């Protein structure tokens, strides 16, 4: 862990217990965990905290409860604000490993309903509560009371069945998880779980989702433009 964070560290980079965070807009913060998967080294996973009005929002927990607990105390003397709700993108270890940190923390968790289905049989906990989508990718506004400036698409399949995206109104910013990989990947990264037909469809379906967004956020690369969604598309056109 402590040699791979220095030398991903750069200038706007702030450090607090294991954690590192990245102011990405006035209001949009950048939280980022490691992990050490022995045989390849140690992994960075990030997620957003979003500050909207009198509440705190967080997309995605860290890689583990002790991470996500983390997290809540930098948020709770940085920002000082109480956390609202939790969104988390699908159902891996990177994006739901925190889940019982909220939990205990007493904070509304919601995730795709196939998300929660999958999480038993992934080794995750489920969240509390289901979102679910129209046709159109969008989320239904019944599932999602109270999100604030947080836009829920659901792109399709494609990184895996479940994974959603998340933009935020009043920004630049569009958060694609790990379905989008960076403009200069020379691979999709882990396709265990990847549906290799609809990928590319659903990786320009995010895309055009957020047809404004210039600043795309995602969980193995520090924030990168447009490129990245189009550059994941065309090396997901060589799967199907
Ligand atoms: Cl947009």
Same mark, same amino acid.
């Given at each position: 862990?402590?040699?791979?964070?220095?030398?991903?560290?750069? %200038?706007?980079?702030? /450090?607090?217990?294991?954690?590192?965070?990245?102011?990405?807009?006035?209001?949009?913060?950048?939280? *980022?965990?490691?992990?050490?998967?022995?045989?390849?080294?140690?992994?960075?996973?990030?997620?957003?905290?979003?500050?909207?009005?009198?509440?705190?929002?967080?997309?995605?927990?860290?890689?583990?409860?002790?991470?996500?607990?983390?997290?809540?105390?930098?948020?709770?003397?940085?920002?000082?604000? &109480?956390?609202?709700?939790?969104?988390?993108?699908?159902?891996?270890?990177?994006?739901?490993?925190?889940?019982?940190?909220?939990?205990?923390?007493?904070?509304? *968790?919601?995730?795709?309903?196939?998300?929660?289905?999958?999480?038993?049989?992934?080794?995750?906990?489920?969240?509390?509560?289901?979102?679910?989508?129209?046709?159109? !990718?969008?989320?239904? &506004?019944? *599932?999602? &009371?109270?999100?604030?400036?947080?836009?829920?698409?659901?792109?399709?399949?494609?990184?895996?069945?479940?994974?959603? %995206?998340?933009?935020?109104?009043?920004?630049?910013?569009?958060?694609?998880?790990?379905?989008?990989?960076?403009? =200069? $990947?020379?691979?999709?990264?882990?396709? !265990?779980?990847?549906?290799?037909?609809?990928? $590319?469809?659903?990786?320009?379906?995010?895309?055009?989702?957020? &047809?404004? $967004?210039?600043?795309?956020?995602?969980?193995?690369?520090?924030?990168?433009? /447009?490129?990245?969604?189009?550059? *994941?598309? /065309?090396?997901?056109? =060589?799967? /199907?």
């Amino acid at each position: 862990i402590r040699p791979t964070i220095g030398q991903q560290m750069e %200038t706007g980079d702030q /450090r607090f217990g294991d954690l590192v965070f990245r102011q990405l807009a006035p209001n949009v913060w950048q939280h *980022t965990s490691y992990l050490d998967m022995p045989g390849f080294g140690a992994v960075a996973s990030n997620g957003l905290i979003v500050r909207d009005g009198g509440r705190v929002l967080v997309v995605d927990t860290a890689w583990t409860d002790d991470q996500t607990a983390q997290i809540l105390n930098w948020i709770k003397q940085e920002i000082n604000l &109480p956390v609202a709700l939790a969104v988390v993108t699908h159902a891996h270890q990177d994006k739901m490993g925190g889940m019982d940190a909220l939990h205990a923390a007493g904070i509304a *968790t919601y995730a795709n309903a196939l998300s929660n289905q999958l999480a038993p049989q992934e080794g995750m906990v489920a969240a509390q509560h289901s979102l679910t989508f129209a046709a159109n !990718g969008w989320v239904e &506004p019944a *599932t999602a &009371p109270n999100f604030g400036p947080l836009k829920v698409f659901y792109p399709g399949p494609g990184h895996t069945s479940d994974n959603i %995206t998340v933009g935020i109104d009043g920004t630049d910013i569009a958060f694609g998880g790990c379905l989008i990989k960076d403009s =200069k $990947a020379k691979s999709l990264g882990n396709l !265990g779980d990847a549906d290799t037909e609809h990928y $590319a469809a659903s990786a320009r379906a995010f895309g055009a989702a957020f &047809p404004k $967004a210039s600043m795309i956020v995602m969980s193995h690369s520090a924030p990168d433009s /447009r490129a990245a969604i189009t550059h *994941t598309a /065309r090396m997901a056109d =060589k799967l /199907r």
